[PDB]
Design an enzyme around this catalytic site. Structure first.
Site, PDB file in Angstrom:
ATOM      1  N   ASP A 162       0.819  -1.209   0.000  1.00 23.74           N
ATOM      2  CA  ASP A 162       0.000   0.000   0.000  1.00 23.74           C
ATOM      3  C   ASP A 162       0.855   1.263   0.000  1.00 23.74           C
ATOM      4  O   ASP A 162       1.369   1.677   1.045  1.00 23.74           O
ATOM      5  CB  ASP A 162      -0.888  -0.003   1.234  1.00 23.74           C
ATOM      6  CG  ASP A 162      -1.855   1.174   1.277  1.00 23.74           C
ATOM      7  OD1 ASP A 162      -2.137   1.772   0.214  1.00 23.74           O
ATOM      8  OD2 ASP A 162      -2.355   1.483   2.384  1.00 23.74           O
ATOM      9  N   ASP A 186      -1.343   5.427  -5.673  1.00 21.41           N
ATOM     10  CA  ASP A 186      -1.814   4.589  -4.574  1.00 21.41           C
ATOM     11  C   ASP A 186      -2.129   3.152  -4.982  1.00 21.41           C
ATOM     12  O   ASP A 186      -3.187   2.888  -5.542  1.00 21.41           O
ATOM     13  CB  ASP A 186      -3.057   5.232  -3.973  1.00 21.41           C
ATOM     14  CG  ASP A 186      -3.577   4.490  -2.786  1.00 21.41           C
ATOM     15  OD1 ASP A 186      -2.856   3.602  -2.282  1.00 21.41           O
ATOM     16  OD2 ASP A 186      -4.707   4.809  -2.349  1.00 21.41           O
TER      17      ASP A 186
HETATM   18  N1  LIG Z   1      -4.492   3.336   0.059  1.00 20.10           N
HETATM   19  C1  LIG Z   1      -5.317   2.933   1.026  1.00 20.10           C
HETATM   20  N2  LIG Z   1      -4.923   2.246   2.086  1.00 20.10           N
HETATM   21  C2  LIG Z   1      -6.098   1.939   2.946  1.00 20.10           C
HETATM   22  C3  LIG Z   1      -7.190   2.820   2.327  1.00 20.10           C
HETATM   23  O1  LIG Z   1      -6.661   3.226   1.037  1.00 20.10           O
HETATM   24  C4  LIG Z   1      -6.429   0.465   2.813  1.00 20.10           C
HETATM   25  C5  LIG Z   1      -6.556  -0.056   1.540  1.00 20.10           C
HETATM   26  C6  LIG Z   1      -6.882  -1.377   1.320  1.00 20.10           C
HETATM   27  N3  LIG Z   1      -6.943  -1.770   0.033  1.00 20.10           N
HETATM   28  C7  LIG Z   1      -7.455  -2.904  -0.466  1.00 20.10           C
HETATM   29  O2  LIG Z   1      -8.063  -3.753   0.166  1.00 20.10           O
HETATM   30  C8  LIG Z   1      -7.252  -3.039  -1.966  1.00 20.10           C
HETATM   31  C9  LIG Z   1      -8.161  -3.685  -2.800  1.00 20.10           C
HETATM   32  C10 LIG Z   1      -7.898  -3.755  -4.170  1.00 20.10           C
HETATM   33  C11 LIG Z   1      -6.732  -3.166  -4.661  1.00 20.10           C
HETATM   34 CL1  LIG Z   1      -6.302  -3.195  -6.344  1.00 20.10          CL
HETATM   35  C12 LIG Z   1      -5.875  -2.536  -3.777  1.00 20.10           C
HETATM   36  N4  LIG Z   1      -6.142  -2.479  -2.484  1.00 20.10           N
HETATM   37  C13 LIG Z   1      -7.056  -2.219   2.430  1.00 20.10           C
HETATM   38  C14 LIG Z   1      -6.924  -1.702   3.722  1.00 20.10           C
HETATM   39  C15 LIG Z   1      -6.615  -0.364   3.926  1.00 20.10           C
HETATM   40  O3  LIG Z   1      -6.483   0.084   5.197  1.00 20.10           O
HETATM   41  C16 LIG Z   1      -5.984   1.324   5.405  1.00 20.10           C
HETATM   42  C17 LIG Z   1      -5.662   1.678   6.709  1.00 20.10           C
HETATM   43  N5  LIG Z   1      -5.171   2.878   6.999  1.00 20.10           N
HETATM   44  C18 LIG Z   1      -4.968   3.832   6.062  1.00 20.10           C
HETATM   45  C19 LIG Z   1      -4.435   5.076   6.464  1.00 20.10           C
HETATM   46  C20 LIG Z   1      -4.155   6.111   5.582  1.00 20.10           C
HETATM   47  C21 LIG Z   1      -3.633   7.368   5.925  1.00 20.10           C
HETATM   48  C22 LIG Z   1      -3.086   7.432   7.355  1.00 20.10           C
HETATM   49  O4  LIG Z   1      -3.876   6.672   8.283  1.00 20.10           O
HETATM   50  C23 LIG Z   1      -4.131   5.317   7.815  1.00 20.10           C
HETATM   51  C24 LIG Z   1      -5.271   3.527   4.730  1.00 20.10           C
HETATM   52  C25 LIG Z   1      -5.791   2.273   4.394  1.00 20.10           C
END
Ligand SMILES: NC1=N[C@@]2(CO1)c1cc(NC(=O)c3ccc(Cl)cn3)ccc1Oc1cnc(C3=CCCOC3)cc12
Length: 377
Positions: free
Chosen positions: A34, A219
């Site tokens: 990520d 991202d």
């Molecule tokens: N970029 C991004 N990271 C995510 C949301 O978007 C996050 C994304 C995911 N993404 C996916 O499950 C996923 C699904 C399909 C594809 Cl192609 C890519 N990723 C999962 C958990 C998650 O859990 C997260 C947890 N915390 C964050 C934070 C972001 C900024 C600072 O605080 C935390 C972000 C995320």
């Protein structure tokens, strides 16, 4: 870097994960890659969705920071306990580092039922780490403690997906043509500046600030190309006009329903290419990246109620700015050149295309007032 090629696995709609080990003796976990977050956070309790989880009681090298972390984000939440331990990437460089690990003890809508990953590897910068920027991100720890160069690159290949995360370098077999670099505007997210947008070569002719309101990021943890509301409207209007030989319901464009065709006869030709021009390395110089409908029309497999080749429209509106997610990155080999504060794009040797069109990275173009395209509070 042959050992790192093909070190990414996944499934459609579930993201790309890399194998890692934590603790002594090493505990193997699959970890989502990520570039839109900055914490290394792993399942540490037996959530029923999880194949496995970090068992700190089995690790002799585990150290407790005696501190908790609560992390709500837009689509879910996780909570956990901070510590450090030894971490390595089996199909990565041959090193072991002491890294911060958040042991996840409670979550909601974070883990995906049916996925094969158990943690998240936030590759972005300390500024957005939780609880604060004193919690050094994994990649920072890796570079500080070893001689691994300060860059990584991602080839995301889009029902099983695959790809490569080249840690500390670039593998030239993974792309064709040249890399073109755009500056990292600020080190928090992987923030960049879009200076122009075209649909089938036709400029949307918006004030370019609209394209980066209030930011634009690269991202790997998001599926869609997400666009600010006003830009999405204009983009969809133009995409509708270009594809108007067939008509589709209003819900489809909103990603509220799918659209289906007979197997092997999807009309790619009627859908336009999308071009984003990015700020270049030189004053008044830009380049453009171009994606196909093969990137932004994403096939949905698990439609039990249908028999045909269905697809979701994977461009959507945002309130958090432009997000260049999987829809963009699956077109390209992407180099996160942290050492030089820039991101390189080149045509991916694995991107999905047809006999008539391919994804493209082209330059140089002459674009003035590119600094005005950035948003400031
Ligand atoms: N970029 C991004 N990271 C995510 C949301 O978007 C996050 C994304 C995911 N993404 C996916 O499950 C996923 C699904 C399909 C594809 Cl192609 C890519 N990723 C999962 C958990 C998650 O859990 C997260 C947890 N915390 C964050 C934070 C972001 C900024 C600072 O605080 C935390 C972000 C995320």
């Amino acid at each position: 870097f042959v050992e790192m090629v093909d070190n990414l696995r996944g499934k459609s709609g579930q993201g790309y994960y890399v194998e890692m080990t934590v603790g002594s003796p090493p505990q193997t976990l699959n970890i989502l890659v990520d570039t839109g977050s900055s914490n290394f956070a792993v399942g540490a309790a037996p959530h029923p969705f999880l194949h496995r989880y970090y068992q700190r009681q089995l690790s002799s090298t585990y150290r407790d920071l005696r501190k908790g972390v609560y992390v709500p984000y837009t689509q879910g939440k996780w909570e956990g306990e901070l510590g450090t331990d030894l971490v390595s990437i089996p199909h990565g460089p041959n090193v072991t580092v002491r890294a911060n690990i958040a042991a996840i003890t409670e979550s909601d809508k974070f883990f995906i039922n049916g996925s094969n990953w158990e943690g998240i590897l936030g590759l972005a910068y300390a500024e957005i780490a939780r609880p604060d920027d004193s919690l050094e991100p994994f990649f920072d720890s890796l570079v500080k403690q070893t001689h691994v160069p300060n860059l990584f690159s991602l080839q995301l290949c889009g029902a099983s997906v695959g790809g490569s995360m080249i840690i500390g370098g670039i593998d030239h077999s993974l792309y064709t043509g040249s890399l073109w670099y755009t500056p990292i505007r600020r080190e928090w997210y992987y923030e960049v500046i879009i200076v122009r947008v075209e649909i089938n070569g036709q400029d949307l002719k918006m004030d370019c600030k609209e394209y980066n309101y209030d930011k634009s990021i690269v991202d790997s943890g998001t599926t869609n190309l997400r666009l600010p509301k006003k830009v999405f409207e204009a983009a969809v209007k133009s995409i509708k006009a270009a594809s108007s030989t067939e008509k589709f319901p209003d819900g489809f464009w909103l990603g509220e329903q799918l659209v289906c065709w007979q197997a092997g006869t999807t009309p790619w030709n009627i859908f336009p290419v999308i071009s984003l021009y990015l700020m270049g390395e030189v004053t008044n110089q830009s380049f453009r990246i171009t994606i196909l409908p093969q990137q932004y029309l994403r096939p949905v497999e698990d439609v039990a109620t249908s028999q045909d080749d269905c697809y979701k429209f994977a461009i959507s509106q945002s309130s958090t700015g432009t997000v260049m997610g999987a829809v963009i990155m699956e077109g390209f080999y992407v180099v996160f050149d942290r050492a030089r504060k820039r991101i390189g794009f080149a045509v991916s040797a694995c991107h999905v295309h047809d006999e008539f069109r391919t994804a493209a990275v082209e330059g140089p173009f002459v674009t003035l007032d590119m600094e005005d395209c950035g948003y400031n509070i």
